[PDB]
């Protein structure tokens, strides 16, 4: 009975303001990610590795507000957060307020596996990750036109 | 926000969440997403949960752990615990959103009280289900 | 870490916690103290809790909310919920610490599994009690 | 109904062998004074929320306790402070983490609770929000005490 569920965010999604082709881009992205998780589960991969990979793919996909495609703050910056929890060991890892880590869920897993801590924040979280070989990315690699236009509209 | 929950062939549960927060957010605000028990929780005894929606309300309501505790201590089904948290408790605090959950028996729930939630799920070896709207 | 819980004449519960963390801590670590449900929780339906001790275990076990949920959903008394969390569940995960708690009926509990906990309590109009050791 | 306060100043390895009665009495006297202030406030009809805020503010101000003044030192000889407060009536909460320039973190947490739509803020963002609401900027040096610096030194090597 192995199973995966994913989400890409809850909120005001308006169908009047949507075309079917626009919707299908989201459906296709979700379907591809769930299929990757299903195949990993069928292959005997761990639940922890499956949720990590699914969230890494949602981060990579610019359609979803995580990683690449992150929304903008009041200051036109990105501040990213992630968590991961293993139901077997009850171990967890989390980062908040990081701007220089491409894949926050991977940094969260690094906190869980390579420290005794659950949660790290900001530059201290980044420095923990960098000291362990995780790459420092330009803070601007997350930026997209669509999310910048939504920022402009939020202000108005 | 994005998230995933899974039950593997060895009966293990896990959960993950990742986000950029909210458009136009005040720098330094932390929502429930990186908070164990608020945005994300997993326990093989009960459930794996990942949340999305009004950040402050999911923290105040400890929404992800509340699903677990309603099942474990309250004896609620996954569906009843999800209905209680998402359709009753979150709106009572002024909150909007949803979550995804899988229990240790492989029941799945994708409740939300918003106009939409980008979501998908599927059992291993089966065709996935996708959705956006209600 | 320090903390306070109170029940007022109007029947309201509140909790607060403050800390410097651990000597020699790695900069950027957040323990369970600022986190609703881990280090601090209050709900007039159940309990007010402030925690102190092994940071990572109080988060993983959501200790403060777990007291509340054991009482509200499980029907445990304050004393029973405190014993369950502090003397059974937290040690099972390798956690050391304690907490202070007042329930909506005015019962007070100051459980700890450590050698000591600096603590004090008192009813309005009564003499205070203080302690360090067991 | 019967109003009541409890406080704590931390759980851990205290041994009698390590302590003098005068050392113990400093802790007892501080705890007694703070709980007595809380009791008096409750008796006078002050809210539980105001009572736990004031008690924790006093525990912060007290150098004996690891919060506010008397905070432990990090690996980098810095102070990083955190606090939370929660109201059981409204289920509102406020919290700050990783703050170094706010004298009383619990007051900053109460400011997040009462003067924002948020529950938690961290680091410089939290400080900037507090300063925008008129809270005073302090140097993190104000938290430093000889006792806690000596504990950092005893836990490490010099170089
Ligand atoms: Cl909506
Ligand atoms: Cl399916
Ligand atoms: Cl749909
Ligand atoms: Cl001990
Ligand atoms: Cl004693
Ligand atoms: Na993305
Ligand atoms: Na202090």
Author numbering:
A (entry chain AAA): 3 to 158
B (entry chain BBB), C (entry chain DDD): 179 to 312
D (entry chain CCC): 2 to 160
Article passage:
l-Asparaginases hydrolyze l-asparagine to l-aspartic acid and ammonia. The prototypic class 2 enzyme is EcAIII from E. coli. EcAIII belongs to the Ntn-hydrolases, which are expressed as immature polypeptides that dimerize and then autocatalytically cleave themselves into α (∼20 kDa) and β (∼15 kDa) subunits to form the mature (αβ)2 heterotetramer (a dimer of two αβ heterodimers). The same Thr179 acts as the nucleophile in the autoproteolytic maturation and in l-asparagine hydrolysis.
As this is currently the highest resolution EcAIII structure deposited in the PDB, this variant will be discussed separately. High-quality electron-density maps allowed us to observed fine details, for example the environment of Thr179 and the octahedral coordination sphere of the Na+ ion in the stabilization loop. In mutant RDM1-18 the D211W substitution introduced a bulky Trp side chain into the immediate neighborhood of the Thr179 nucleophile. Nevertheless, this mutation did not affect autoprocessing. The side chain of Trp211 filled the available space between the threonine triad and the fragment built from residues 207–210 containing the S211P substitution. In chain B, disorder was detected in the active site, while in the corresponding region of subunit D two alternative conformations of Trp211 are visible. The double conformation of Trp211 is correlated with the behavior of the 230–236 fragment, for which two alternative conformations are also visible. Waters w3 and w4 are absent in variants with bulky side chains at position 211, such as Gln (RDM1-3) or Trp (RDM1-18). The observations collected in this list indicate that even small distortions of any element responsible for maintaining the fragile architecture of the autoproteolytic center can abolish or significantly impair the autocleavage process. As shown in Fig. 8(b), the mutations introduced in the autoprocessed RDM1 variants were not harmful to the sensitive apparatus, and even the large side chain of Trp211 in variant RDM1-18, located in the close proximity of the nucleophilic Thr179, did not perturb the autoprocessing.
